From Swiss-Prot, chain A:
Belongs to the universal ribosomal protein uS7 family. This is Small ribosomal subunit protein uS7. There is a cross-link at residues 26, 184 (Glycyl lysine isopeptide (Lys-Gly) (interchain with G-Cter in ubiquitin)). GO terms for cellular component: 90S preribosome; cytoplasm; cytosol; cytosolic small ribosomal subunit; ribosome. SUPFAM superfamilies: Ribosomal protein S7. PANTHER family: RIBOSOMAL PROTEIN S7 (PTHR11205). The keyword Transmembrane does not apply.
From Swiss-Prot, chain C:
The modification Phosphoserine is found at residues 16, 48. The modification Omega-N-methylarginine is found at residue 65. Component of the ribosome, a large ribonucleoprotein complex responsible for the synthesis of proteins in the cell. The small ribosomal subunit (SSU) binds messenger RNAs (mRNAs) and translates the encoded message by selecting cognate aminoacyl-transfer RNA (tRNA) molecules. The large subunit (LSU) contains the ribosomal catalytic site termed the peptidyl transferase center (PTC), which catalyzes the formation of peptide bonds, thereby polymerizing the amino acids delivered by tRNAs into a polypeptide chain. This is Small ribosomal subunit protein uS3. There is a cross-link at residues 25, 51, 60, 70 (Glycyl lysine isopeptide (Lys-Gly) (interchain with G-Cter in ubiquitin)). It comes from Saccharomyces cerevisiae (strain ATCC 204508 / S288c) (Baker's yeast). Belongs to the universal ribosomal protein uS3 family. Component of the small ribosomal subunit (SSU). Mature yeast ribosomes consist of a small (40S) and a large (60S) subunit. The 40S small subunit contains 1 molecule of ribosomal RNA (18S rRNA) and 33 different proteins (encoded by 57 genes). The large 60S subunit contains 3 rRNA molecules (25S, 5.8S and 5S rRNA) and 46 different proteins (encoded by 81 genes). It is found in: Cytoplasm. The chain holds residues 82 to 161 of 240 of the full protein. Present with 146000 molecules/cell in log phase SD medium.
UniProtKB/Swiss-Prot annotation, chain H:
Present with 48100 molecules/cell in log phase SD medium. There are 2 genes for uS13 in yeast. GO terms for molecular function: rRNA binding; structural constituent of ribosome. The gene is RPS18A. GO terms for biological process: cytoplasmic translation; endonucleolytic cleavage in ITS1 to separate SSU-rRNA from 5.8S rRNA and LSU-rRNA from tricistronic rRNA transcript (SSU-rRNA, 5.8S rRNA, LSU-rRNA); ribosomal subunit export from nucleus. Keywords: Acetylation, Cytoplasm, Isopeptide bond, Methylation, Ribonucleoprotein, Ribosomal protein, RNA-binding, rRNA-binding, Ubl conjugation. Belongs to the universal ribosomal protein uS13 family. This is Small ribosomal subunit protein uS13A. N-terminally acetylated by acetyltransferase NatA. It is found in: Cytoplasm. Coiled coil: none annotated. The modification N-acetylserine is found at residue 1.
UniProtKB/Swiss-Prot annotation, chain I:
It comes from Saccharomyces cerevisiae (strain ATCC 204508 / S288c) (Baker's yeast). One of its GO terms (molecular function) is structural constituent of ribosome. Component of the ribosome, a large ribonucleoprotein complex responsible for the synthesis of proteins in the cell. The small ribosomal subunit (SSU) binds messenger RNAs (mRNAs) and translates the encoded message by selecting cognate aminoacyl-transfer RNA (tRNA) molecules. The large subunit (LSU) contains the ribosomal catalytic site termed the peptidyl transferase center (PTC), which catalyzes the formation of peptide bonds, thereby polymerizing the amino acids delivered by tRNAs into a polypeptide chain. Component of the small ribosomal subunit (SSU). Mature yeast ribosomes consist of a small (40S) and a large (60S) subunit. The 40S small subunit contains 1 molecule of ribosomal RNA (18S rRNA) and 33 different proteins (encoded by 57 genes). The large 60S subunit contains 3 rRNA molecules (25S, 5.8S and 5S rRNA) and 46 different proteins (encoded by 81 genes). Gene3D superfamilies: Nucleic acid-binding proteins. It comes from the Eukaryota. N-terminally acetylated by acetyltransferase NatB. This is Small ribosomal subunit protein eS28A.
RNA sequence: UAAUUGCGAUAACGAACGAGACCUUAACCUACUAAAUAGUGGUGCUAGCAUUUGCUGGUUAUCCACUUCUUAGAGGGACUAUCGGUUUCAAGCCGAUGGAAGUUUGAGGCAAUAACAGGUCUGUGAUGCCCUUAGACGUUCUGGGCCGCACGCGCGCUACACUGACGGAGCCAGCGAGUCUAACCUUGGCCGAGAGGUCUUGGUAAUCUUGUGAAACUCCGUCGUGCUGGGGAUAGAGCAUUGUAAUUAUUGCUCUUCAACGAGGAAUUCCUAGUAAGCGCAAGUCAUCAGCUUGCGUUGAUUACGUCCCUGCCCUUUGUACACACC
């Protein structure tokens, strides 16, 4: 890769794997496709970046949240429940570890394992609280491809969060266990559980 | 080609020198140093019982090195953490003075440090070269 | 000797709302009425080169339950 | 929302009425004209006004403006 | 309960099993076996003798090991 | 003698980070230490980032002194990655050529995570009635 | 910038509305090198209400 | 790398100071089951007794158990400073003590009895079951028992 | 299991008494010659593609 | 439209108060005037590693230069600009591009008319009336009390742990305060496990405390789901600190006792971007005492960009036997 030298070293695993291709921590963004139409344009995996941490600004205009990579949008949903709010550095360290666990468990691209999980968990149709009259019944509206990513990540973290509570495992582990059961709807995934529950209800009250 | 302590990982550096000190026999580990807590803010005594004093001492050497002068006071707050006050909220609490002081006096006996003008201590040429020689060792530790 | 008192007149007492405030005191202290002493001071202010004027009297005007009569004229601003 | 007040729009209607040939379609130049033919007490207003004068301009040169 | 001391028979398991799974962490040894977990952390420094398991990611919060070679 | 050096800064929140770019042997140092060692940790490459999107060779002829103050652990990081990428484009601006400079700009703004334009976000004043800028104390009615 | 924060209410009635008053103090210094006359001259030719002036001799 | 096993040398649940002490819990925190020893004290006694703190309570020979009990009751004779002790400057003997075992409930019963006998205010508070340190009792302290 | 994609042409307004549901008009993706009005849950703009469960339906006003 | 904000419709025409303008604060400025109480580059003098010139420092001014970062004067800058999509193709709204900034730029200060039997006579040497005035309801002094504890309600702090606790090591803020006829903010030296003691010192302060080396946090390890080393209430024993004075523990320190709490029922508050939440810090009080408030920065998100379903207020229509006005 033509290793040039300067007064302050700079490592070789740095020079090469970077200036060639802008990999993740060191994972490739290329050769990873959103294996479900209608959810592209949103699940942002096309602009590469090194760490899932940026001085974002996605709360000014409405839909700008989408030019945000799903990796970082996944990380950001990790840091919650009061005692965890604002601790992003911890979360990125959780996610970086979560991808290594995944990659080990099933080859592939871990960033693809994640993207797979989001697509298969976003509820296609859903239930709304209609007027109903007294004992207010329901109606079966569909859900936006933005929400399909929103509530997905939402489920995939609440899953791993409540999983790894008073349990011997770590967050990176129960998140690599919840991403894997969602990358191929094993139905042992908390998210896949909720998803096949919403569509089930939205099919029953239409 | 000319190594500073400002070229070594602070974790790597201080890990290294705090072993070069313990295996060097002479510093001056205080009479307590097996019962003490390092700060009233702390809860338990340091887990590395045998040579935690060597840990701190090394860290201070590095710390004074990259400065002009730093007295007992500045060091007591540098190593002070948070203090659980039980059912009340946490505040900052300064660390033990005897500890940092006895470090700064035992470090004069080995000429790593010395009383400076303007108050406080300062790293000397004897120690300046001493951390600049062990800076290499933990920077050349690539086989 | 290190401190000396001087004595000016005034920059037209029809613009200083302090001298006028003191005037309203004395007028009412001189037994004069509410609406008389109020309109009187106001009209003096208007004919003094001001843009506007407001003289409000609060308290018990007709005894018992206290009230508040506002005697204003000209142009006023309030806010900024 | 950004709805210009009458004090602004009044100045806009007034200038154009008696200063159309000098006024242009550009904010920056208009802004400088206002300082030569009008006494304004704050910078923002003058910028606020000169910005609306140019708003009318860019649509006068597109057909006559209502009033 | 769990095991906070090697029963030697327990040392038979560790040397002949861990090369089966391609992911071995602190909790892995706790779930499959019943190590104390305090003696799992030490079990991992040991298992990197000549490297029955190979490292890819070592960290205070998380230990990510793999199968052999 | 006094060298052909240039000087830019980079602010993130309350972290203003001065930079100096003189013609030299390609050293890149922050706070008396080489850039390899920037130990807020995971955000390491955040300061490497400008040295890769623009070609590692651009820096070999120039020295980088970056001194940092204020802000916090993360804010200083984004403040130094910004001071660096801003002095390079300011080096080609003065000492080199216009064509080359915009080539460097184009490499950043096509990726820009602040990099060479200041993030204007600041904290909001608290006002009486609560602890946060918007947050309000709990009320109890009846 | 001097700051004084108080409660708007005398006594304790109502929603808890606070205030905050400021006093702003501006400081600056000018250095000069001038003999006998221009010293007391410069102190009294440039005097003004509201503006405080003090001149230091030198050294210690 | 203490990947050592030991056959039938390990003996969980032994007995010291008339109390039951689990073996599977580490040394420092094992002893702390004893009424009178806590985290900092049990951390210190085992240091003076040249015990390798990494072990579990189930390890350590009866010899290594004897050098701990002995130090523990005669603490001040082993370079254990008096501030580390739970009953210094008694009131009826003037010596520095560090009462353990049953004698924490004993000397507590005594101290409470002492200033109850002499009918001190604090004592009467200990008698009436109320709170003896000047805290409030109007809004808190409910539920009782 | 039959599943139909649908791409937005135009967005009407917002129904539901609370304002939760949004009415929209879509093509039928694989067949441009169709056009159906559907109710949505989340935020939908134009050009984003729905995922229709039952590919007939076509509802209207909602509280 | 945030707005009686505006386009317009027009028996109205033209206006004033309020809103807006305004003022403050936070954002931009390599353009101007400057700086030993703010900085940087060179240079002396000097230390260390390398000696290959190099890299990292010391030096209150060694000398010279400059104003990028800091300060604050004087100004510039935005006007939702430019283009497009919409609509009476009007006010305006939406999008994209540019820009330090495009949500009233963010946040505030100010704030009409008229009203309330809202609170305050315990802030006032503001006050009418009454009360009382030497066995005082005046003043002062000793002691006690305002905290008294079967219980009901409000605001809060710490928590239930592994997204953690403990032990090391890493080390980064901003808003602020500070001593005369006096004892404040306190560096440094020594002493002490600590809390604290003693000897000096600087500072009436961009100078000294102070780079307020703050906490969360980063890392490395110990513990390993066990009311556990999570949690720190109750209580015993001892050392100090404020003060004339500490018992009814003022507060701090050390040892020990090691509770309830395993995510909280019906209900219910707050919140839309550096916002919530978490984190600590200065300031008020202050001899001593913050789990309180007024501010500040550190880390820093999920969701919404909508509606009138609920709770309110506004306008219009309407009913009235209400006008002391649906108490």
């Amino acid at each position: 890769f033509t290793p040039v030298v300067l007064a302050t070293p700079i490592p070789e695993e740095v020079q090469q794997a970077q200036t060639e291709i802008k990999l993740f921590n060191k994972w490739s963004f290329e050769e990873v496709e959103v294996k479900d139409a209608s959810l592209v344009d949103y699940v942002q995996v096309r602009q590469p970046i090194f760490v899932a941490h940026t001085a974002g600004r996605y709360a000014n205009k409405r839909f700008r949240k989408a030019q945000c990579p799903i990796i970082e949008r996944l990380t950001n949903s990790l840091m919650m429940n009061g005692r965890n709010n604002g601790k992003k550095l911890k979360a990125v360290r959780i996610i970086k570890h979560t991808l290594d666990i995944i990659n080990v468990l099933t080859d592939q691209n871990p960033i693809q394992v994640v993207v797979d999980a989001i697509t298969n968990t976003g509820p296609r149709e859903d239930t709304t609280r209609v007027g109903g009259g007294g004992a207010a019944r329901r109606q079966a509206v569909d859900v936006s491809p933005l929400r399909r990513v929103n509530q997905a990540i939402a489920l995939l973290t609440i899953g791993a969060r409540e999983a790894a509570f008073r349990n011997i495992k770590t967050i990176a582990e129960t998140l690599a266990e919840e991403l894997i059961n969602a990358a191929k709807g094993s139905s042992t995934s908390y998210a896949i559980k909720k998803k096949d529950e919403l569509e089930r209800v939205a099919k029953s009250n239409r | 080609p000319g190594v500073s302590v400002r070229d070594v990982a602070a974790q790597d550096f201080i890990n290294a020198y705090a072993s070069f000190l313990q295996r060097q026999g002479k510093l001056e580990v205080p009479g307590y140093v097996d019962i003490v807590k390092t700060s009233s803010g702390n809860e338990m005594p340091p887990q590395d019982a045998e040579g935690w004093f060597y840990k701190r001492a090394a860290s201070v050497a590095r710390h004074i090195y990259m400065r002009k002068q730093v007295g007992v006071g500045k060091l007591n707050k540098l190593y002070g953490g948070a203090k659980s006050r039980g059912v009340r909220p946490y505040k900052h609490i300064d660390a033990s003075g005897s500890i940092n002081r006895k470090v700064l006096q035992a470090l004069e006996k080995i000429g790593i440090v010395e009383i400076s003008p303007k108050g406080g201590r300062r790293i000397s040429e004897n120690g300046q070269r001493d951390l600049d020689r062990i800076a290499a060792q933990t920077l050349e530790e690539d086989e | 000797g290190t401190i000396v008192l001087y004595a000016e007149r005034v920059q037209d007492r029809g613009l200083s709302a302090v001298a006028q405030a003191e005037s309203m005191k004395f007028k009412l202290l001189n037994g004069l009425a509410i609406r008389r002493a109020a309109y009187g001071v106001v009209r003096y202010v208007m004919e003094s080169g001001a843009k506007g004027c407001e003289v409000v009297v609060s308290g018990k005007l007709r005894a018992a339950r206290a009230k508040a009569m506002k005697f204003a004229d000209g142009f006023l601003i309030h806010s900024g | 929302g950004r709805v210009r007040t009458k004090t602004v729009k009044r100045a806009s209607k007034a200038l154009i009425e008696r200063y159309y040939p000098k006024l242009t379609l550009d904010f920056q130049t208009n802004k400088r004209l206002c300082d030569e033919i009008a006494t304004i007490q704050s910078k923002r207003l003058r910028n606020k006004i000169a910005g609306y004068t140019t708003h009318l301009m860019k649509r006068i040169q597109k057909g006559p403006v209502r009033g | 309960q769990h095991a906070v001391i090697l029963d030697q028979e327990k040392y038979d398991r560790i040397l002949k099993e861990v090369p089966t799974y391609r992911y071995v962490s602190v909790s892995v040894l706790v779930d499959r076996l019943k190590i104390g977990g305090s003696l799992a952390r030490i079990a991992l420094r040991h298992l990197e003798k000549e490297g029955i398991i190979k490292p890819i990611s070592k960290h205070s919060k998380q230990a990510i090991y793999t199968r052999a070679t | 003698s006094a060298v052909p050096s240039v000087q830019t800064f980079g602010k993130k929140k309350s972290a203003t980070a001065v930079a100096h770019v003189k013609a030299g042997k390609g050293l890149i140092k922050v706070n008396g230490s080489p850039i390899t060692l920037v130990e807020p940790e995971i955000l390491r490459f955040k300061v490497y980032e400008p040295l890769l999107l623009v070609g590692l060779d651009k820096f070999s002829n120039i020295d980088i002194r970056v001194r940092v103050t204020g802000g916090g652990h993360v804010s200083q990081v984004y403040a130094i990655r910004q001071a660096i990428a801003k002095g390079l484009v300011a080096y080609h601006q003065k000492y080199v050529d216009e064509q080359s400079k915009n080539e460097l700009k184009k490499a950043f703004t096509s990726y820009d995570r602040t990099l060479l334009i200041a993030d204007s976000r600041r904290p909001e004043p608290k006002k009486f009635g609560g602890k946060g800028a918007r947050s309000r104390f709990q009320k109890s009615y009846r | 910038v001097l700051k004084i924060s108080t409660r708007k209410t005398p006594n304790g009635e109502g929603s808890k509305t606070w205030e905050t008053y400021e006093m702003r103090i501006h400081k600056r210094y000018i250095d000069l090198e001038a003999p006998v006359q221009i010293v007391k001259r410069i102190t009294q030719i440039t005097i003004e209400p509201g503006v405080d002036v003090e001149v230091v001799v030198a050294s210690n | 790398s203490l990947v050592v096993q030991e056959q039938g040398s390990f003996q969980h649940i032994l007995r010291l100071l008339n109390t039951n002490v689990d073996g599977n819990i580490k040394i420092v925190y094992a002893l702390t089951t004893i009424k009178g020893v806590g985290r900092r004290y049990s951390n210190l006694v085992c240091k003076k007794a040249d015990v390798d703190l990494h072990k579990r309570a189930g390890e350590l020979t009866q010899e290594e158990l004897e050098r701990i009990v002995q130090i523990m009751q005669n603490p001040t004779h082993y370079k254990i400073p008096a501030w580390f002790l739970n009953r210094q400057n008694d009131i009826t003997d003037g010596k520095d003590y560090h009462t353990l075992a049953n004698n924490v409930e004993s000397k507590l019963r005594d101290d409470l009895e002492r200033l109850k006998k002499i009918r001190a205010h604090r004592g009467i508070r200990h008698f009436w079951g109320l709170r003896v340190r000047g805290q409030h009792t109007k809004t808190t302290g409910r539920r009782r028992a | 299991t039959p599943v139909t994609l649908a791409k937005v042409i135009k967005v009407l307004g917002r129904t539901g008494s609370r304002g939760g549901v949004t009415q929209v008009r879509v093509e039928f993706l694989e067949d441009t010659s169709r056009t159906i009005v559907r109710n949505v849950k989340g935020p939908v703009r134009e050009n984003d593609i729905l995922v229709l469960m039952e590919s007939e339906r076509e509802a209207r006003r909602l509280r």
